[PDB]
A paper describes a structure:
Streptococcus pneumoniae scavenges essential zinc ions from the host during colonization and infection. This is achieved by the ATP-binding cassette transporter, AdcCB, and two solute-binding proteins (SBPs), AdcA and AdcAII.
In this study, we investigated the Zn(II)-binding mechanism of AdcAII by mutating each of the four Zn(II)-coordinating residues in the SBP. Structural analyses of Zn(II)-bound AdcAII variants revealed that specific regions within the protein underwent conformational changes via direct coupling to each of the metal-binding residues. The binding site mutations impacted protein conformation and interaction with Zn(II) to differing extents. Taken together, these data demonstrate the importance of SBP-metal complex conformation for bacterial Zn(II) uptake.
Residue numbers in the entry: 28 to 127, 133 to 255, 259 to 305
Write the structure that this text describes.
Amino acid sequence: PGKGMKIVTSFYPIYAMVKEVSGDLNDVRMIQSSSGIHSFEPSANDIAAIYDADVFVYHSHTLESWAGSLDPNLKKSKVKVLEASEGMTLERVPGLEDVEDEKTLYDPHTWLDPEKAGEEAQIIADKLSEVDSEHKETYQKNAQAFIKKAQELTKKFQPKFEKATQKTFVTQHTAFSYLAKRFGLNQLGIAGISPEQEPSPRQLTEIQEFVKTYKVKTIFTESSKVAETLVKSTGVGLKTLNPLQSDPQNDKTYLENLEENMSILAEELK
Ligand SMILES: [Cl-]
Ligand SMILES: [Zn+2]
Ligand SMILES: [Zn+2]
Ligand SMILES: [Zn+2]
Ligand SMILES: [Zn+2]
Ligand SMILES: [Zn+2]
Ligand SMILES: [Zn+2]
Ligand SMILES: [Zn+2]
Ligand SMILES: [Zn+2]
Ligand SMILES: [Zn+2]
Ligand SMILES: [Zn+2]
């Protein structure tokens, strides 16, 4: 290897965690997934790049289902496909919890919990240390340093959330379910598990009733149009909250961007 293993990642959380666990060791790139990860269909060029790589890392078969149809053996490729969330426990989708198509029941937005981002980093560090065992002492040392700062960041917002008077927030899509359950909050998504799941009229009426009931002052959006109409019917305000679905394109690391989003959330819920 020149620079190292040529690793390709699914989207921004996986890219950031692989780049921080690997450190200055390997050449890590990610396919262009700015346009939605839930409604992302890869091109032939991206698939050819994945087959010409050493390691491909994706989050879960519940998010990037197109990574399951990948078959490296029949295409004479040596790429090692790694599921970064193998072994993790996925909670039920809000609104489908007592349901018993089976991929729809589990929420894949598990990288926004600071603690479950840390679990993903350990799994990547172990998996990359089965694939390139010689540099394993570094994959763990860097994985162990990220979990500590994620643990350092989770015991810091615990008290801020603990003293919040309002524990309910509404978001453009249902992505903050794990983060909300982490700090004892109650969230409601307008578009649900996927931004292409626009609400039904009855669901829209129930969302209006919910905003009026729990005195939700602001609606967190992403940088959808239906979310931009409830401001009239409810009188709420529009504040930004990035679910880190894509690259923020700045100098901060992953946990720093997560810290910024949590800080916005904590300053609003007071
Ligand atoms: Cl998302
Ligand atoms: Zn299509
Ligand atoms: Zn799987
Ligand atoms: Zn496995
Ligand atoms: Zn239940
Ligand atoms: Zn190596
Ligand atoms: Zn080395
Ligand atoms: Zn406490
Ligand atoms: Zn989402
Ligand atoms: Zn009702
Ligand atoms: Zn910090």
